[PDB]
Amino acid sequence: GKKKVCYYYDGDIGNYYYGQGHPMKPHRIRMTHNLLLNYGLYRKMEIYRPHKATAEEMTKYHSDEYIKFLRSIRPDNMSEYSKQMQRFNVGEDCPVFDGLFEFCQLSTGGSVAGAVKLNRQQTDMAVNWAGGLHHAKKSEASGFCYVNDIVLAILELLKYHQRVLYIDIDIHHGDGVEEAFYTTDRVMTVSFHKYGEYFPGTGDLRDIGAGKGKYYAVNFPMRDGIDDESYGQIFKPIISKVMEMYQPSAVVLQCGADSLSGDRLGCFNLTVKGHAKCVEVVKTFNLPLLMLGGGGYTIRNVARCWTYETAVALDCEIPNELPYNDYFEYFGPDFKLHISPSNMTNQNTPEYMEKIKQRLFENLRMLP
Ligand SMILES: O=C(N[C@@H](CCCCNC(=O)c1c(O)cccc1F)c1ncc(-c2ccc3ccccc3c2)[nH]1)c1cncs1
Ligand SMILES: [Ca+2]
Ligand SMILES: [Ca+2]
Ligand SMILES: [Zn+2]
């Protein structure tokens, strides 16, 4: 039936700024929050302001040296850290900005807090749109990500769940999460992403895990222009097979919105309905579920996507006509919630989609 939803947000998150021209805009989280508030979605969920995750909480995954670096570096002292900046990949993509550490603490706090709430059986779903920073590694920032809130949240879920399923619908391969759990069967990672001359370069169909983790990493490589139809040919059949074989007791779903049509950095052609159908499919299994954010660079579409996915989590129908809100002008010229796909060519033929699905089904037959 209808599920209980806990939503994590800190009103300060929208004030963090990556710098002039940087495509990552934390303000998109504030736009999402304001839109879902104006739709009245606050009357149906418990809203929490997560704590600032401590350096000690972050070192459950990250190295002590890397976390100490993040907690020490500032724009005014950067010149003294040129050596560590190179070592930790802090530079162009992952710049030093005012409040960087606090931004990491809030993004991480929401994911860990949601995982604790699910562990305590006090909610069916927990949502942290400021999380989903799948590219961060043990001792390295990457792809606009510094602290891997997902890995930390999964480590929290593993305290009470034998098997945790991680699903990632961001356009980019979920590399940091896949690497963290590559040699264990206690987490299955499933990533659907653009593959081929594309960041971060990993996520080949043939990357299936190693040691005890062999067959517990699943990668669905895609070409430009995937549409709702192509994604629909494979998402439910693959997730259904994974649920059947793996039988997880908790699920983490990364909902990166850079897989939407019209994204500034992405090259996919999903609509908000197509992207949200993934949330509907996963939610249907009725398992404890942590929903996280991720990429997304056409910020009016990110706000639409995550507002609609919050309504999907709540089983709440909302009108296509947008309510008035603090960012109303960003949603012109139509002022509607849903988006139309572009005319871009879908390079993922129906035959290619079925063929990759069949190769993944062969690997899933290898689970015990
Ligand atoms: O291609 C490389 N970088 C990629 C990284 C894209 C990472 C995407 N991350 C997410 O989508 C993501 C996610 O999936 C989940 C959670 C959070 C996330 F952020 C890149 N695309 C564009 C730029 C860009 C453009 C303009 C700039 C202007 C000012 C300063 C820096 C700018 C950076 N950077 C390379 C690096 N080193 C060698 S090649
Ligand atoms: Ca992905
Ligand atoms: Ca694994
Ligand atoms: Zn991304």
Short mmCIF file of C-alpha atoms and ligand atoms in Angstrom, two decimals:
data_model
loop_
_atom_site.label_atom_id
_atom_site.label_comp_id
_atom_site.label_asym_id
_atom_site.label_seq_id
_atom_site.Cartn_x
_atom_site.Cartn_y
_atom_site.Cartn_z
CA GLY A 1 0.00 0.00 0.00
CA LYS A 2 1.02 3.62 0.67
CA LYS A 3 4.40 4.07 2.33
CA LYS A 4 5.82 6.40 5.00
CA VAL A 5 8.38 8.90 3.59
CA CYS A 6 11.08 10.77 5.52
CA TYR A 7 12.78 13.60 3.67
CA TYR A 8 16.16 15.12 4.56
CA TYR A 9 17.06 18.72 3.77
CA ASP A 10 19.13 21.57 5.12
CA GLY A 11 18.11 25.07 4.01
CA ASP A 12 21.78 26.09 3.78
CA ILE A 13 22.58 23.55 1.03
CA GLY A 14 21.55 25.88 -1.80
CA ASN A 15 24.12 28.51 -0.76
CA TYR A 16 27.24 26.42 -1.57
CA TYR A 17 28.88 27.64 -4.78
CA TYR A 18 31.38 25.68 -6.86
CA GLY A 19 32.55 28.82 -8.71
CA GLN A 20 32.00 30.78 -11.91
CA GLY A 21 31.06 28.53 -14.82
CA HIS A 22 31.04 25.30 -12.78
CA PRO A 23 28.01 23.26 -13.91
CA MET A 24 27.26 21.84 -10.43
CA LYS A 25 24.68 24.13 -8.80
CA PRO A 26 23.61 23.18 -5.26
CA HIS A 27 20.81 25.80 -5.65
CA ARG A 28 18.96 23.11 -7.66
CA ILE A 29 18.28 21.33 -4.30
CA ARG A 30 16.64 24.52 -2.94
CA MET A 31 14.58 24.82 -6.18
CA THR A 32 13.45 21.19 -5.76
CA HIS A 33 12.51 21.82 -2.12
CA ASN A 34 10.59 25.01 -2.89
CA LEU A 35 8.67 23.39 -5.75
CA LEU A 36 7.67 20.33 -3.72
CA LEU A 37 6.63 22.66 -0.82
CA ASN A 38 4.43 24.71 -3.21
CA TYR A 39 2.80 21.45 -4.46
CA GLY A 40 1.90 20.73 -0.78
CA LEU A 41 4.03 17.56 -0.58
CA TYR A 42 5.15 18.62 2.98
CA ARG A 43 1.70 17.66 4.40
CA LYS A 44 2.36 13.99 3.59
CA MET A 45 6.00 13.39 4.69
CA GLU A 46 8.23 13.87 7.76
CA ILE A 47 10.86 16.53 7.01
CA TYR A 48 14.18 16.33 8.88
CA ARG A 49 17.27 18.56 8.90
CA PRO A 50 20.16 16.10 9.01
CA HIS A 51 23.11 16.52 11.33
CA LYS A 52 26.51 17.55 9.96
CA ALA A 53 28.29 14.16 9.50
CA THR A 54 31.55 14.14 11.45
CA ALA A 55 35.03 13.48 10.02
CA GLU A 56 34.96 10.27 12.10
CA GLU A 57 31.69 9.17 10.39
CA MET A 58 33.31 9.83 6.97
CA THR A 59 36.40 7.78 7.83
CA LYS A 60 34.22 4.64 8.04
CA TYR A 61 35.08 4.59 4.28
CA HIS A 62 37.45 7.42 3.39
CA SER A 63 41.09 7.59 4.44
CA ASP A 64 42.01 9.63 7.51
CA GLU A 65 44.45 11.74 5.43
CA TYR A 66 41.86 12.56 2.76
CA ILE A 67 39.19 13.59 5.32
CA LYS A 68 41.74 15.67 7.30
CA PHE A 69 42.62 17.42 4.02
CA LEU A 70 38.94 18.19 3.21
CA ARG A 71 38.37 19.57 6.73
CA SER A 72 41.51 21.81 6.48
CA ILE A 73 41.62 23.22 2.97
CA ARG A 74 40.07 26.62 2.24
CA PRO A 75 40.39 29.13 -0.65
CA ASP A 76 42.61 31.35 1.63
CA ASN A 77 45.14 28.57 2.42
CA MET A 78 45.02 26.59 -0.94
CA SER A 79 48.57 27.75 -1.87
CA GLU A 80 50.00 25.70 1.02
CA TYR A 81 48.23 22.50 -0.19
CA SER A 82 49.34 22.25 -3.86
CA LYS A 83 50.87 18.77 -3.19
CA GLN A 84 47.79 17.31 -1.44
CA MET A 85 45.43 18.89 -4.02
CA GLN A 86 47.10 16.85 -6.76
CA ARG A 87 47.15 13.69 -4.62
CA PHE A 88 43.42 14.01 -3.82
CA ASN A 89 42.26 15.27 -7.26
CA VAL A 90 41.10 18.64 -5.99
CA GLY A 91 41.39 21.11 -8.83
CA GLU A 92 39.30 21.92 -11.89
CA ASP A 93 36.36 19.45 -11.55
CA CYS A 94 36.45 19.34 -7.78
CA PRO A 95 37.41 22.84 -6.65
CA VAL A 96 38.11 24.28 -3.24
CA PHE A 97 35.15 26.49 -2.34
CA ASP A 98 33.94 28.32 0.79
CA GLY A 99 32.26 25.82 3.11
CA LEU A 100 33.35 22.73 1.09
CA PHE A 101 33.61 20.54 4.20
CA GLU A 102 30.24 21.66 5.58
CA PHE A 103 28.65 20.94 2.17
CA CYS A 104 30.11 17.39 2.41
CA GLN A 105 28.82 17.06 5.99
CA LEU A 106 25.26 17.96 4.97
CA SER A 107 25.17 15.81 1.82
CA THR A 108 26.51 12.87 3.86
CA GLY A 109 24.40 13.58 6.95
CA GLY A 110 21.19 13.22 4.97
CA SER A 111 22.13 9.81 3.51
CA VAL A 112 23.44 8.37 6.76
CA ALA A 113 20.43 9.74 8.70
CA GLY A 114 18.06 8.17 6.16
CA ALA A 115 19.85 4.82 6.48
CA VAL A 116 19.57 4.98 10.33
CA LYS A 117 15.83 5.71 10.03
CA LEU A 118 15.36 2.70 7.69
CA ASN A 119 17.45 0.50 10.05
CA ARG A 120 15.19 1.48 12.95
CA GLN A 121 12.13 0.45 10.86
CA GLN A 122 10.71 3.95 11.37
CA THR A 123 10.12 4.67 7.65
CA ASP A 124 9.52 2.81 4.41
CA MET A 125 11.40 5.38 2.28
CA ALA A 126 14.04 7.99 3.10
CA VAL A 127 14.93 10.74 0.58
CA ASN A 128 18.09 12.85 0.40
CA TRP A 129 18.25 14.86 -2.83
CA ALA A 130 21.56 16.43 -1.72
CA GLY A 131 23.18 12.96 -1.74
CA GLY A 132 24.03 10.42 -4.44
CA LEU A 133 27.69 11.53 -4.91
CA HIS A 134 28.77 8.27 -6.47
CA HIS A 135 32.11 9.33 -7.94
CA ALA A 136 34.03 10.02 -4.70
CA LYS A 137 36.67 7.43 -3.91
CA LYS A 138 38.39 6.29 -0.68
CA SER A 139 41.19 8.88 -0.97
CA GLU A 140 40.19 10.98 -3.98
CA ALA A 141 37.57 13.48 -5.09
CA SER A 142 36.17 12.96 -8.60
CA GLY A 143 33.44 14.24 -10.88
CA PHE A 144 32.28 17.09 -8.62
CA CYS A 145 32.04 14.59 -5.66
CA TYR A 146 34.20 14.69 -2.54
CA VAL A 147 32.64 12.39 0.07
CA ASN A 148 30.79 9.25 -0.97
CA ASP A 149 27.60 9.58 1.02
CA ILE A 150 26.24 6.47 -0.76
CA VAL A 151 29.02 4.17 0.43
CA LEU A 152 28.64 5.52 3.98
CA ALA A 153 24.86 5.03 3.91
CA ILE A 154 25.29 1.45 2.60
CA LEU A 155 27.82 0.68 5.36
CA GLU A 156 25.13 1.90 7.82
CA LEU A 157 22.46 -0.34 6.20
CA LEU A 158 24.87 -3.32 6.35
CA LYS A 159 24.70 -3.16 10.17
CA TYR A 160 21.12 -4.57 9.94
CA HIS A 161 20.86 -5.97 6.38
CA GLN A 162 22.74 -9.00 5.06
CA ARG A 163 22.31 -7.98 1.41
CA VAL A 164 21.89 -4.44 0.09
CA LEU A 165 20.99 -3.64 -3.51
CA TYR A 166 22.32 -0.40 -5.05
CA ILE A 167 20.68 0.85 -8.33
CA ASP A 168 22.05 3.88 -10.20
CA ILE A 169 20.15 5.67 -12.99
CA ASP A 170 22.46 8.68 -13.26
CA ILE A 171 23.93 9.04 -16.78
CA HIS A 172 27.43 8.40 -15.37
CA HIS A 173 28.77 5.06 -14.22
CA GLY A 174 28.46 4.62 -10.41
CA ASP A 175 32.21 3.97 -10.16
CA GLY A 176 32.97 4.94 -6.55
CA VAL A 177 30.18 2.78 -5.18
CA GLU A 178 31.04 -0.15 -7.48
CA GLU A 179 34.72 0.02 -6.46
CA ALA A 180 33.97 0.21 -2.72
CA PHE A 181 32.02 -3.04 -2.84
CA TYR A 182 33.69 -4.78 -5.82
CA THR A 183 34.92 -7.80 -3.83
CA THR A 184 31.87 -8.43 -1.61
CA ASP A 185 28.56 -10.23 -2.18
CA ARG A 186 26.89 -8.17 0.63
CA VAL A 187 26.16 -5.34 -1.83
CA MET A 188 25.04 -5.77 -5.42
CA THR A 189 25.69 -2.64 -7.54
CA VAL A 190 23.62 -2.12 -10.71
CA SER A 191 24.49 0.87 -12.93
CA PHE A 192 22.75 2.00 -16.18
CA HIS A 193 24.95 4.60 -17.88
CA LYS A 194 26.36 6.13 -21.02
CA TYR A 195 29.51 4.17 -21.96
CA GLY A 196 32.03 5.10 -24.64
CA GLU A 197 34.29 8.23 -24.72
CA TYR A 198 32.49 9.42 -21.61
CA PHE A 199 33.23 10.25 -18.00
CA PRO A 200 34.38 8.42 -15.89
CA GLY A 201 35.41 5.74 -18.46
CA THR A 202 34.42 2.67 -16.45
CA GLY A 203 31.32 0.47 -16.42
CA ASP A 204 31.95 -1.98 -19.26
CA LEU A 205 29.43 -4.82 -19.60
CA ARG A 206 32.34 -7.19 -18.70
CA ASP A 207 33.05 -5.54 -15.30
CA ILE A 208 31.16 -8.00 -13.12
CA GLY A 209 33.03 -7.99 -9.80
CA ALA A 210 35.94 -9.98 -8.39
CA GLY A 211 36.54 -12.66 -5.73
CA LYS A 212 33.48 -13.10 -3.50
CA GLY A 213 31.96 -10.14 -5.42
CA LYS A 214 32.08 -11.92 -8.83
CA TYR A 215 28.59 -11.52 -10.40
CA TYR A 216 27.63 -8.88 -7.78
CA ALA A 217 28.47 -5.84 -10.00
CA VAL A 218 26.13 -5.26 -12.99
CA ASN A 219 26.75 -2.66 -15.71
CA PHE A 220 24.37 -1.76 -18.55
CA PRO A 221 26.39 0.33 -21.03
CA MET A 222 24.33 2.68 -23.22
CA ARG A 223 24.82 4.96 -26.22
CA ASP A 224 23.56 8.51 -26.79
CA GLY A 225 19.91 9.31 -27.02
CA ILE A 226 18.25 6.64 -24.93
CA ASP A 227 14.53 7.32 -24.62
CA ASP A 228 11.67 6.25 -22.32
CA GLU A 229 10.89 3.33 -24.67
CA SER A 230 14.40 1.91 -24.67
CA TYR A 231 14.77 2.33 -20.89
CA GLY A 232 11.36 0.64 -20.48
CA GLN A 233 12.48 -2.39 -22.56
CA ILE A 234 15.10 -3.25 -19.92
CA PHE A 235 14.72 -1.59 -16.49
CA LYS A 236 11.84 -3.59 -14.95
CA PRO A 237 13.00 -6.98 -16.44
CA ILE A 238 16.57 -6.47 -15.10
CA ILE A 239 15.54 -5.19 -11.66
CA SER A 240 12.94 -8.00 -11.37
CA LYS A 241 15.59 -10.61 -12.15
CA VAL A 242 18.06 -9.01 -9.71
CA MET A 243 15.38 -8.95 -6.95
CA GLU A 244 14.53 -12.63 -7.64
CA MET A 245 18.15 -13.83 -7.59
CA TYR A 246 19.72 -11.54 -5.00
CA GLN A 247 16.78 -11.13 -2.58
CA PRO A 248 18.08 -7.93 -0.93
CA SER A 249 16.58 -6.69 2.34
CA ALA A 250 17.28 -2.96 1.66
CA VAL A 251 17.71 -0.88 -1.50
CA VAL A 252 19.54 2.35 -2.33
CA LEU A 253 18.41 4.11 -5.54
CA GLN A 254 20.57 6.91 -6.95
CA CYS A 255 18.26 9.15 -9.08
CA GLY A 256 20.80 11.35 -10.88
CA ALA A 257 18.85 13.66 -13.20
CA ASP A 258 21.64 14.10 -15.77
CA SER A 259 20.00 11.17 -17.67
CA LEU A 260 17.09 13.54 -18.62
CA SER A 261 16.50 14.99 -22.06
CA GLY A 262 18.01 18.47 -22.43
CA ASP A 263 20.67 18.07 -19.71
CA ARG A 264 23.60 20.48 -20.16
CA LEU A 265 26.21 17.73 -19.71
CA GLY A 266 24.26 14.58 -20.53
CA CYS A 267 23.34 13.02 -23.86
CA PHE A 268 20.24 10.94 -22.97
CA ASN A 269 16.60 11.66 -23.87
CA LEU A 270 14.46 10.49 -20.95
CA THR A 271 11.44 12.48 -19.80
CA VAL A 272 10.64 13.03 -16.09
CA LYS A 273 7.93 10.31 -16.42
CA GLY A 274 10.46 7.89 -17.95
CA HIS A 275 13.04 8.59 -15.25
CA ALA A 276 10.37 8.33 -12.48
CA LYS A 277 9.13 4.99 -13.82
CA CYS A 278 12.39 3.61 -12.31
CA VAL A 279 11.34 4.86 -8.86
CA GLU A 280 7.89 3.28 -9.38
CA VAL A 281 9.50 -0.08 -10.36
CA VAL A 282 11.83 -0.16 -7.34
CA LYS A 283 9.24 1.11 -4.84
CA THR A 284 6.89 -1.71 -5.95
CA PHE A 285 9.13 -4.40 -4.33
CA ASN A 286 8.15 -2.99 -0.91
CA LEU A 287 11.62 -3.03 0.58
CA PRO A 288 13.29 -0.37 2.81
CA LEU A 289 14.43 2.21 0.26
CA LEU A 290 16.87 5.12 0.38
CA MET A 291 16.36 7.52 -2.60
CA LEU A 292 19.25 9.84 -3.38
CA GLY A 293 20.05 12.61 -5.84
CA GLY A 294 23.04 12.82 -8.17
CA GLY A 295 23.95 14.72 -11.30
CA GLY A 296 21.66 17.08 -13.21
CA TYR A 297 22.67 20.32 -14.90
CA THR A 298 19.53 21.89 -16.50
CA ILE A 299 18.32 22.90 -13.07
CA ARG A 300 14.65 23.57 -13.91
CA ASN A 301 14.48 19.89 -15.06
CA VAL A 302 16.27 18.61 -11.97
CA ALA A 303 13.67 20.38 -9.78
CA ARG A 304 10.82 18.94 -11.87
CA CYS A 305 12.32 15.42 -11.76
CA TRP A 306 12.93 15.25 -8.04
CA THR A 307 9.63 16.93 -7.18
CA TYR A 308 7.80 14.32 -9.29
CA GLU A 309 9.85 11.45 -7.80
CA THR A 310 8.98 12.70 -4.28
CA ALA A 311 5.26 12.61 -5.33
CA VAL A 312 5.84 9.06 -6.70
CA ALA A 313 7.37 8.00 -3.33
CA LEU A 314 4.26 9.38 -1.58
CA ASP A 315 1.74 7.83 -4.09
CA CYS A 316 0.48 11.43 -4.51
CA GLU A 317 -0.85 12.68 -7.84
CA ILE A 318 0.19 16.27 -8.59
CA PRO A 319 -1.01 18.50 -11.46
CA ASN A 320 1.09 19.22 -14.53
CA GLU A 321 0.36 22.98 -14.09
CA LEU A 322 3.17 24.21 -11.81
CA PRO A 323 2.13 26.03 -8.66
CA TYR A 324 3.56 29.52 -8.12
CA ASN A 325 6.95 29.29 -6.32
CA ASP A 326 10.12 31.30 -5.63
CA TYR A 327 11.70 30.19 -8.88
CA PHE A 328 8.63 30.29 -11.13
CA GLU A 329 10.42 32.12 -13.93
CA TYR A 330 12.96 29.29 -14.27
CA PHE A 331 10.13 27.04 -15.56
CA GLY A 332 9.11 29.15 -18.55
CA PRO A 333 7.98 29.29 -21.24
CA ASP A 334 5.48 26.52 -20.40
CA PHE A 335 5.32 26.49 -16.57
CA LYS A 336 4.51 22.75 -16.59
CA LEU A 337 6.00 19.88 -14.56
CA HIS A 338 6.49 17.36 -17.36
CA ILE A 339 8.93 17.62 -20.22
CA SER A 340 9.00 16.48 -23.84
CA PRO A 341 11.85 14.45 -25.35
CA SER A 342 14.01 16.09 -28.00
CA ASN A 343 14.35 14.88 -31.63
CA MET A 344 17.88 13.50 -31.00
CA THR A 345 18.65 10.13 -32.53
CA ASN A 346 18.50 7.20 -30.17
CA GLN A 347 21.69 5.25 -30.94
CA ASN A 348 20.50 2.36 -28.72
CA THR A 349 18.69 0.13 -31.18
CA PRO A 350 15.97 -2.14 -29.79
CA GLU A 351 18.23 -5.10 -30.81
CA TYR A 352 21.17 -3.68 -28.84
CA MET A 353 18.96 -3.21 -25.75
CA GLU A 354 17.73 -6.80 -25.87
CA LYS A 355 21.22 -8.16 -26.52
CA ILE A 356 22.82 -6.37 -23.53
CA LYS A 357 19.86 -7.48 -21.36
CA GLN A 358 20.43 -11.09 -22.46
CA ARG A 359 24.16 -10.91 -21.55
CA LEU A 360 23.25 -9.51 -18.10
CA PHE A 361 20.64 -12.28 -17.61
CA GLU A 362 23.42 -14.87 -18.33
CA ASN A 363 25.52 -13.34 -15.52
CA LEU A 364 22.51 -13.26 -13.15
CA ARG A 365 22.07 -17.05 -13.70
CA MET A 366 25.47 -17.41 -11.96
CA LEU A 367 24.19 -16.19 -8.58
CA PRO A 368 23.61 -18.95 -5.94
O1 LIG B 1 35.56 14.93 -18.34
C1 LIG B 1 36.06 15.35 -17.31
N1 LIG B 1 35.36 15.94 -16.33
C2 LIG B 1 33.92 16.06 -16.36
C3 LIG B 1 33.35 15.58 -15.03
C4 LIG B 1 31.84 15.45 -15.00
C5 LIG B 1 31.35 15.03 -13.63
C6 LIG B 1 29.85 14.89 -13.59
N2 LIG B 1 29.38 14.49 -12.27
C7 LIG B 1 28.11 14.14 -12.08
O2 LIG B 1 27.30 14.06 -13.01
C8 LIG B 1 27.67 13.81 -10.68
C9 LIG B 1 27.01 12.59 -10.47
O3 LIG B 1 26.87 11.74 -11.51
C10 LIG B 1 26.50 12.30 -9.22
C11 LIG B 1 26.62 13.20 -8.18
C12 LIG B 1 27.27 14.41 -8.37
C13 LIG B 1 27.78 14.68 -9.61
F1 LIG B 1 28.43 15.85 -9.79
C14 LIG B 1 33.46 17.45 -16.69
N3 LIG B 1 32.48 17.67 -17.54
C15 LIG B 1 32.31 19.02 -17.54
C16 LIG B 1 33.19 19.64 -16.69
C17 LIG B 1 33.39 21.06 -16.39
C18 LIG B 1 32.80 22.04 -17.19
C19 LIG B 1 32.97 23.37 -16.92
C20 LIG B 1 33.74 23.79 -15.81
C21 LIG B 1 33.90 25.16 -15.47
C22 LIG B 1 34.62 25.52 -14.37
C23 LIG B 1 35.23 24.56 -13.57
C24 LIG B 1 35.10 23.23 -13.87
C25 LIG B 1 34.35 22.81 -14.99
C26 LIG B 1 34.16 21.44 -15.31
N4 LIG B 1 33.93 18.60 -16.16
C27 LIG B 1 37.51 15.19 -17.04
C28 LIG B 1 38.26 15.47 -15.94
N5 LIG B 1 39.60 15.16 -16.01
C29 LIG B 1 39.85 14.63 -17.17
S1 LIG B 1 38.51 14.49 -18.24
CA CA B 2 24.53 5.06 -13.57
CA CA B 3 29.54 -6.03 -5.14
ZN ZN B 4 26.19 12.14 -13.32
#
